[PDB]
Amino acid sequence: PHSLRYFVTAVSRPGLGEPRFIAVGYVDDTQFVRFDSDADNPRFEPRAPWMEQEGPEYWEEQTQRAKSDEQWFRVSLRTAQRYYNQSKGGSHTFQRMFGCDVGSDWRLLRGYHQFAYDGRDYIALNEDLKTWTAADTAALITRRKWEQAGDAEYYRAYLEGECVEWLRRYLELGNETLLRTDSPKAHVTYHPRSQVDVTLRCWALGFYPADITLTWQLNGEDLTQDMELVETRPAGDGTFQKWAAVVVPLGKEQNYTCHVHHKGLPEPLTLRW
């Protein structure tokens, strides 16, 4: 499977000028473009090396769509402020996520078009790409408006056409790097914590893609009720990092096994301290 995503944030700053608009685009776990309204000449720019050979036409159309959306968000933030009967001086946020997923055949599994206002769900297009989910009463007003105006068909036409068509093209531009995996380099570390117990940390380093499963097991049984897990973190080179830890009795280290699942690993790893 492959994915195309755009993460769009519009934050009004009353008294500090016009709202701040950022849209950042991803294919899978690799950022490929960004637009930031506060940049030099604000425009869509390549954020991956395989994007830099695109012509002036591609960038001008992308830049024009970002500027259209920027005005759409300033209007939408003002409209939402009236919907919620909010006062004039607060900063508020609209967020929009959109993109598409493709399978082994590289045809659309699902398209996304969903919004958050002030960090919470606002309205989302359903998997049918025909109906909307309003999170609250202000979003029911929005749902009535877009259903009458046939907004769903407008996004659906993009999701079924341009989004998949260009996501497949991006897979060609970055084929040598986007389709690669880096299997995790995994190790277990040991740190004493008491005179009674020890922390065993299972490490995974230098892996792409970001998706991974780490589990600790005792005598073949998941210890996820005792696991401390951090979020998968980016190394900064395109790879990711993660660890899972269990706290176990002194002298019991060799009874615990950590298991590693990753798209680069045909078989899951079993490691011991």
Binding site: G25, S68, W72, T142, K145, C163
Partner: peptide, 9 residues
């Protein structure tokens, strides 16, 4: 390929 919004919220 980015797409711009149509109807306002």
């Amino acid at each position: 390929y980015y797409q711009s919004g149509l109807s306002i919220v």
